[PDB]
RNA sequence: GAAGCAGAAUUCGGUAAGCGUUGGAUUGUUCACCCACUAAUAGGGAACGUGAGCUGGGUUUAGACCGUCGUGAGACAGGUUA
RNA sequence: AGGGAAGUCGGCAAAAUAGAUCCGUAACUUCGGGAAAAGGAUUGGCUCUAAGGGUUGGGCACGUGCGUGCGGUUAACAACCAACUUAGAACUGGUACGGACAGGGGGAAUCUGACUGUCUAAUUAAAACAUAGCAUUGCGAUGGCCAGAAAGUGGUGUUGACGCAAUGUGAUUUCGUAGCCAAAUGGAUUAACGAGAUUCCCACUGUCCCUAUCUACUAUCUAGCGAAACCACAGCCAAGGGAACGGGCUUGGCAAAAUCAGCGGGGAAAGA
RNA sequence: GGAGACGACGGCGGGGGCCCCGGGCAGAGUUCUCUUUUCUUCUUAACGGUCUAUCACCCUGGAAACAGUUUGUCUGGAGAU
RNA sequence: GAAGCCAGAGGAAACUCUGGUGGAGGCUCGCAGCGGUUCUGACGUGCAAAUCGAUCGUCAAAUCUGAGCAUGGGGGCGAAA
């Protein structure tokens, strides 16, 4: 859910995943040479946090 | 200081030429062309803070006003005051002209 | 040489080793399967019927930890590190 | 050169970063840190400007250089003397401006030990040991733990439970698209620290495509000096030589003095 | 009773020596050009006399409107300035 | 850049914030010293029966080190290999 990501990364206002990773990289300082964002490393961090139980997500059970 | 000065003269480490800077200052269209030859999201400061004089992007307005005091910026200003070297000057050096009828 | 083998592309077979038979990804693994380029990416011997060119795994002196067994010294179904 | 890990078990090695001034710096955290995080701007010379100090010295009335009784805080003034920093500005050379030297590559994670520290002199520096912290047991002196052959023997003991001795463990923490209960939190998915082990990203490059060139010291040749290992005898192969082994035998091929630099197939060669 | 007689570390202050700058005498070097230049000597022991040197102590006096004061906040009616 | 201290702004006070001062730590970079991580390193009948080079760890202390003395093999000593 979107608000879970908002309280997870203290960030808001993205329209797509590329913008989300760019703002996350600029906020966390994940920058390459010239201040270019480290979108690959930030995506790796997001995927690792998703798997390691740091971002809240679950699959709802089917109703009877 | 110059970063990785050993490979400074390689073709992949080339910088923009001073006559190109002259044409960018004179006509905005060439400068716009040089802008779509780059990607805006990977530029320092998202391409908003750009010095045509030094042909360089910067992360912040305070960084731009910072470099304008520096002697690289003043050397670029001095070189543009003397004028860049062109093919017209190359022909005038040997006394060559172009006949177009 | 033969084939409903029109052509194009081939399939099966014969003489032939003259001449070639590549570049990579993958070690939570019998490293064997994938990808592309290519004319094509054929298979073997001279080691493996024991055995001093170089270097990774089987592989295991002395240090150390975990798992199983044993009262214990220790041994191992084993796993890791130098 | 161009490419940039295509090399390799594995980025081994090498390259790249590096001083200082300024801008700026995330998660996590035991709130101390992380942090020089990350990511950027600048650095020469010359001519100037500005700021930052020390020492000496006040007017009357008397007695006669001091004693008084006064009067004043524009000394906010003069004279003399002195050194190193900091900031600002113009001009100027440039392919370089910490110009040699000197001098962090950085980041995302996982495992692991709390950390600083210690050991296998001469193959292993480590998750080993120690450490502080925690828990248990014994002892109130005619006692506990020990030592000595014995002793009118000695230690702990110049000791007395906030102590001594032996153990085990080894910091701290733990032990409903988002609810309830507990003294902000519900944690070990534990911060910092590391010549510990592992994967990846950027940068970087002769690791590679695919090699080439230069320098010094050798190797080489000369003068002088001068060993050792090893050595049954010796040294070209092919086929056969039942005991899966030929260098000497058989049958062939062959086969020409004496040498020098190299090479690592074979014989020799591993305190084998 | 004192001395002998006593840890480690930090900044501050005094003194000696060394280093640095200026003038002068003498000597030496440089000198196409420049350089009143660059360098060298210019020292004072033990032992004594004399005059002074932080701390501290003594006398007068009695401090709030508190004061003195170190780079570092200590001191004073148990008497400060 | 820890306590402690000074000044200013608040706050009824207790406290909060800002600019300084100060110089703690089995802190940290790093010269010496001590040690010994890595190199298809050099060397391998060597300079050496353990040396050389680069690189590395630590560097105010559980640091390094001299001389004198004590512990002696059924032992000693051992942050235990």
Automatic annotation (TrEMBL), chain A:
<comment type="function">
    <text>GTPase that associates with pre-60S ribosomal subunits in the nucleolus and is required for their nuclear export and maturation.</text>
</comment>
<protein>
    <recommendedName>
        <fullName>Nucleolar GTP-binding protein 2</fullName>
    </recommendedName>
</protein>
<comment type="similarity">
    <text>Belongs to the TRAFAC class YlqF/YawG GTPase family. NOG2 subfamily.</text>
</comment>
Automatic annotation (TrEMBL), chain B:
<keyword id="KW-0963">Cytoplasm</keyword>
<keyword id="KW-0539">Nucleus</keyword>
<dbReference type="InterPro" id="IPR022755">
    <property type="entry name" value="Znf_C2H2_jaz"/>
</dbReference>
<keyword id="KW-0863">Zinc-finger</keyword>
<keyword id="KW-0479">Metal-binding</keyword>
<dbReference type="GO" id="GO:0005634">
    <property type="term" value="C:nucleus"/>
</dbReference>
<dbReference type="InterPro" id="IPR036236">
    <property type="entry name" value="Znf_C2H2_sf"/>
</dbReference>
<dbReference type="InterPro" id="IPR013087">
    <property type="entry name" value="Znf_C2H2_type"/>
</dbReference>
<dbReference type="GO" id="GO:0043021">
    <property type="term" value="F:ribonucleoprotein complex binding"/>
</dbReference>
<keyword id="KW-0690">Ribosome biogenesis</keyword>
<keyword id="KW-0862">Zinc</keyword>
<dbReference type="GO" id="GO:0008270">
    <property type="term" value="F:zinc ion binding"/>
</dbReference>
<feature type="binding site">
    <location>
        <position position="54"/>
    </location>
    <ligand>
        <name>Zn(2+)</name>
    </ligand>
</feature>
<dbReference type="GO" id="GO:0042254">
    <property type="term" value="P:ribosome biogenesis"/>
</dbReference>
<feature type="binding site">
    <location>
        <position position="73"/>
    </location>
    <ligand>
        <name>Zn(2+)</name>
    </ligand>
</feature>
<dbReference type="GO" id="GO:0003676">
    <property type="term" value="F:nucleic acid binding"/>
</dbReference>
<dbReference type="InterPro" id="IPR003604">
    <property type="entry name" value="Matrin/U1-like-C_Znf_C2H2"/>
</dbReference>
<feature type="binding site">
    <location>
        <position position="67"/>
    </location>
    <ligand>
        <name>Zn(2+)</name>
    </ligand>
</feature>
<dbReference type="GO" id="GO:0005737">
    <property type="term" value="C:cytoplasm"/>
</dbReference>
<comment type="similarity">
    <text>Belongs to the ZNF593/BUD20 C2H2-type zinc-finger protein family.</text>
</comment>
<protein>
    <submittedName>
        <fullName>Zinc finger domain-containing protein</fullName>
    </submittedName>
</protein>
<dbReference type="Pfam" id="PF12171">
    <property type="entry name" value="zf-C2H2_jaz"/>
</dbReference>
């Amino acid at each position: 859910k979107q608000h879970h990501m908002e309280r997870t990364y203290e960030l808001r206002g993205w329209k797509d995943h590329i913008e989300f990773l760019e703002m996350l990289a600029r906020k966390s300082g994940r920058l390459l040479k010239g201040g270019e964002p480290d979108v690959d490393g930030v995506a790796k961090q997001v995927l690792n946090d998703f798997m390691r139980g740091k971002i809240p997500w679950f699959t709802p059970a089917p109703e009877p | 200081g110059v970063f990785a000065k050993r490979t400074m003269t390689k073709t992949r480490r080339r910088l923009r030429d001073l006559d190109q800077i002259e044409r960018d200052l004179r006509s905005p269209r060439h400068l716009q062309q040089y802008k779509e030859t780059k990607a805006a999201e990977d530029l320092p400061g998202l391409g908003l803070y750009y010095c045509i004089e030094c042909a360089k992007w910067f992360e912040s307005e305070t960084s731009l006003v910072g470099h304008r005091k520096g002697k690289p910026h003043k050397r670029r200003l001095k070189q543009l005051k003397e004028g860049a070297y062109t093919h017209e000057e190359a022909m005038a050096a040997i006394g060559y002209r172009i006949d177009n009828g």
